[PDB]
């Protein structure tokens, strides 16, 4: 299973990142100890040995930076693995959607709906001319300009 192994290796990734964090913490305890030693060297007046103490100060810090880079890189590859799992699952969901897509589009097809296209077109073709014939024969009964003018005059009388 793809999902199962991702969680396992992700939890191992954080397990090891915590070990790296512990290493950083121990080196930082030594960092504080050497900083206190530097302060002790400075007050004694032997500022010359403080140079070697500062070299000690910075070498441990370079080690800290290396460990932090290691931690960030492990985190990065972990995020990449999670990303690939998400992409794979998205593709699977798309395929599942396509399956039901085809299944439910299988019923209605182009030819039998184009037959209805033409059928409705012709039915409306006939209906329009029939309605126009009725409208024309009922409007042929009497004059329209004569009646239409009396219509506005009706509005004044009612109002």
């Amino acid at each position: 299973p793809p999902k199962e192994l991702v969680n396992e290796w992700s939890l191992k990734i954080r397990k090891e990142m915590r070990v790296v964090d512990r290493q950083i913490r121990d080196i930082q305890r030594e960092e504080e100890k050497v900083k206190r030693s530097v302060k002790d060297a400075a007050k004694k007046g032997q500022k010359d040995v403080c140079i070697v103490l500062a070299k000690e100060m910075i070498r441990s810090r370079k080690a800290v930076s290396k460990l932090y880079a290691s931690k960030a890189h492990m985190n990065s590859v972990l995020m990449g693995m999670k990303n690939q799992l998400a992409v794979l699952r998205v593709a699977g969901s798309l395929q599942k959607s396509t399956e039901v897509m085809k299944a439910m589009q299988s019923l209605v097809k182009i030819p039998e709906i184009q037959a209805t296209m033409r059928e409705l077109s012709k039915e409306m073709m006939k209906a329009g001319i029939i309605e126009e014939m009725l409208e024309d024969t009922f409007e042929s009964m009497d004059d329209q300009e004569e009646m239409e003018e009396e219509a506005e005059m009706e509005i004044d009388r009612i109002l």
């Binding site: 959607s97 399956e99 039901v100 209805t116 059928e119 409705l120 029939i130």
Partner: protein, 147 residues
Amino acid sequence: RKTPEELLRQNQRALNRAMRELDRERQKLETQEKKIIADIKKMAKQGQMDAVRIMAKDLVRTRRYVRKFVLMRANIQAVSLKIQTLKSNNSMAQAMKGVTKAMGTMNRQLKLPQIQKIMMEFERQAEIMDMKEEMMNDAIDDAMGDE
């Protein structure tokens, strides 16, 4: 065998589950991101002038990933939005076929020729009314006269 609409509902809510779990993963990464800014701020005062750079790279990379988790969330919802209109199209097709059949059986009742025959008969009878009436008034007004 499964009916087409049964598969549709399952697929839709499976997509919803995928969206929810993508949201959960994004939320976890945002919490990790906040932890990252917290650690950078803690180490910024301490210094080292470079570990802040490594964690800044890690932070922008976390942002880059959450970008596309949101993107896949949108991608998943988009196909659900597409499949929603499919049943609307099918419903319109079926209803349109039904109303087309109704219109056809309505038009088959009175076709072109007999409606025209009704038209001519009614118009001829309207001719007859006017002829009779106007002839009557002509004759009777002529007989009365004097004014």
